[PDB]
Structure 1
């Protein structure tokens, strides 16, 4: 395969459903490269656990943890890392209220080159145990010879775009990583970077981030087809923000409008949202505790009951993961019969204005609260007009894209409810025999 899109290993499925999956120990193995230094961008860290995932011979190499924690949470993280003299920390600035550092990325510097890993898992045991999570693995990027002057840039502009993302932090520890990236050849990269960074962007900067970044890439590098209006949009996520009193406020006015962009020319497009029902969580491998990582609050939900008529169950027989609750987030554009897709995005971004941006100041400014990161797969970047959907995620032309859940998505039944994490479920017990009492 040219796509290098993986799922994490799931404890409890048959071996055939983990053949081709990756655990964090696999990613950090010496088979991938001889580690010199690494940077771990994430939201939540268990530092004792994380160091144990590195190979023993690499556990004293420098590690930088890039996080967004403040005040007592910041102190707690520093306390976790103090026993490890080789670990440094970088607090990403969050100057807009209610923002978080959600980006999940590894920079892995080797003797042999550099690797970039953009993924969806927190650095804690539970996120790699029984969840559905996504990983994109970059090629091994070779170093540019000292004295040679080459750009090292890809046709997707990935090198410049990754440097731009890191520059937004304005952090000394990340200037060091920017200099590392400048020294490597990333020309083989076949994905586009889609990032969010906190701020208020107008003018030339409007298209740099968030859903306007996605819109710009789809305008420039995808083609519109006849009957495009019949190609649905699918969004699949693990959390939902406050989207407003009706769909016209944000979901179907600016978010969907960016997502349905194709080509440079100038809505009844079906919108499918995939989000675990209560029954999905109850019967999952983890049981109700899986809902601890699906943080949809009742306060938000009760203000937007209109949204739930868009919701479809989690189903993933194609990858044997129907009972492995999703923490991956994906967005894609399938054909009307779900046999092809016009593009696929894997990202940290949930269905929220904080992650994707919301227009302000009479439509002239995009305000984003959070850091997010994902990679976009476009057929044009692979010499194709569309991707055929792989029918079985782990089965065997390698130009078919491995969609990790079932299509078409299945609408909630009349008795289904979206998982809401801060109310009790006492009607029926989970796979471990327990109820849920927040």
Structure 2
């Protein structure tokens, strides 16, 4: 089946888990198609076996670091010749944020990964990272259309590039996606012709169709207010109101929402590292550069989230491993759990994605995303409940690198880490 793994780090695992070497190092690998936000080529290319025939790399212009002559050697020179580069030029303040790997093997087998790390050394090793691994797929004719496959193809088409159409999309077409018939592929694209992001994910949740209602986000970037005049958070003021039916598409005052949350027993959660969690990380502030929440200029927005919604959660310090401590994770997850401690072990749905909690990644009801983003959605009604566990205790549908349970910020002491 599909499986979530925790990425091994050179620092945290000194002498299940995955590495880039287990993904790219296998002698039966014929071809990889890579999508990422940054590529350190001498680090990535060292991961591959000498048997590989083609490496196709889709990335944003300026984010593909060439190897300097002084770093070249005999091995890399050979592998470098097998790289085909597809460079996307993006508008300002937009990102090719998707991370995706499509491998093709000798037998005609295909495997897909969503890693949470970009292909650089520091990113692979410092913050915690995960990797979603698809089941094994086979080149073969297919019968029934598989939603995951179909949304993957829309996503590729939305780049509108000849090289993607010919070099990637046609090879993906040949793959039978039946082993993935339960899952959905959810994405953002800046393409104006293809809907995507929040609006599309909302419609898809509506279509897939008393209790306490838990909506948890784990994200390495928290965007600023949706409006300049008022304090409006994407999770608490737009996403959660939409998913619960508090608002329909044709934004409420804060006080109305707080009351609606009491009354409907909606419990919002954002997992984001405190200031103090770096103290108890084994590389201390080494992983902190990846955690973006810039709230000092608009302090009331933060206060609102921290004190009125009480939205912030942190790791359970008593459950983390010694070797990883409270090192925060650069994965992104969005999940919903209905109850009526054990919260989040059985889910209504869970999205694992490259998308951060920002308007540029998601869009809004009326704005389109600016980024490319991709992820995989597990929905109860598509399977009977989605099962989830924490890697800190290490067979469930999902595994997450934060503790379960997560613990509310202590309002007397904890502050979101502010870079």
TM over 0.5, shorter chain: yes
Find the residue that maps to 1:280 and give its secondary structure. Answer: helix
Selected match of 2:159 from 162, 169, 189: 169
Q: Check conservation: 1:282, 1:288, Cα contact below 8 A.
A: yes
Aligned to 1:99: 94
Aligned to 1:48: 42
Q: Aligned pair 1:331/2:354, yes or no?
A: no
Shift of 1:323: 2.8
Shift of 1:126: 1.8
Aligned to 1:77: 65
Q: Aligned pair 1:39/2:26, yes or no?
A: no
Q: Aligned pair 1:416/2:408, yes or no?
A: no
Aligned to 1:254: 238
Shift of 1:352: 0.5
Q: Aligned pair 1:236/2:224, yes or no?
A: no
Aligned to 2:254: none
**Distance in 2 of aligned mates of 1:137 and 1:276:** 26
What is the 5 A alignment of 1:262-277? Answer: 267-268=260-261, 269-277=266-274
Find the residue that maps to 2:407 and give its secondary structure. Answer: coil
Call closer, same or farther: CA 1:400–1:130 in 2, change over 3 Å: same
Kindly indicate which of the two structures has a greater share of residues assigned to strand: 2
CA shift digits 1:288-343 (9 cap, x unpaired): 12111113335665462223342222448666344332111111112345042211
Call closer, same or farther: CA 1:327–1:419 in 2, change over 3 Å: same
Shift of 1:247: 4.9
Call closer, same or farther: CA 1:250–1:401 in 2, change over 3 Å: closer
Shift of 1:103: 0.5
Shift of 1:279: 1.1
Aligned to 1:214: 201
Find the residue that maps to 1:335 and give its secondary structure. Answer: strand
Aligned to 1:433: none
Q: Which moved more, 1:79-88 or 1:167-176?
A: 79-88
Shift of 1:10: 3.6
Q: Aligned pair 1:182/2:164, yes or no?
A: no
Q: Check conservation: 1:130, 1:285, Cα contact below 8 A.
A: no
Q: Check conservation: 1:152, 1:184, Cα contact below 8 A.
A: no
Aligned to 1:368: 369
Shift of 1:390: 3.5
Aligned to 1:350: 356
Shift of 1:152: 6.2
**Distance in 2 of aligned mates of 1:48 and 1:77:** 8
Selected match of 1:62 from 27, 49, 54: 54
Aligned to 1:424: none
Q: Check conservation: 2:183, 2:376, Cα contact below 8 A.
A: yes
Selected match of 1:285 from 282, 301, 304: 282
Aligned to 1:426: none
**Distance in 2 of aligned mates of 1:323 and 1:39:** 33
Aligned to 1:195: 187
Call closer, same or farther: CA 1:9–1:173 in 2, change over 3 Å: same
Aligned to 1:159: 149
Any stretches of 5+ residues in structure 1 without a counterpart?
Answer: 361-365, 422-438
Q: Check conservation: 2:224, 2:233, Cα contact below 8 A.
A: no
Aligned to 2:257: none
Shift of 1:419: 1.4
Q: Check conservation: 2:391, 2:402, Cα contact below 8 A.
A: no
**Distance in 2 of aligned mates of 1:391 and 1:193:** 23
Shift of 1:257: 2.7
**Distance in 2 of aligned mates of 1:186 and 1:299:** 47
Find the residue that maps to 1:359 and give its secondary structure. Answer: coil
Call closer, same or farther: CA 1:48–1:276 in 2, change over 3 Å: same
Q: Check conservation: 1:132, 1:327, Cα contact below 8 A.
A: yes
**Distance in 2 of aligned mates of 1:219 and 1:137:** 27
Shift of 1:104: 0.5
Q: Check conservation: 1:50, 1:123, Cα contact below 8 A.
A: yes
Shift of 1:392: 6.5
TM-score with structure 2 setting the length: 0.81
Call closer, same or farther: CA 1:80–1:67 in 2, change over 3 Å: farther
Find the residue that maps to 1:369 and give its secondary structure. Answer: coil
Q: Aligned pair 1:110/2:105, yes or no?
A: yes
Q: Check conservation: 2:220, 2:290, Cα contact below 8 A.
A: yes
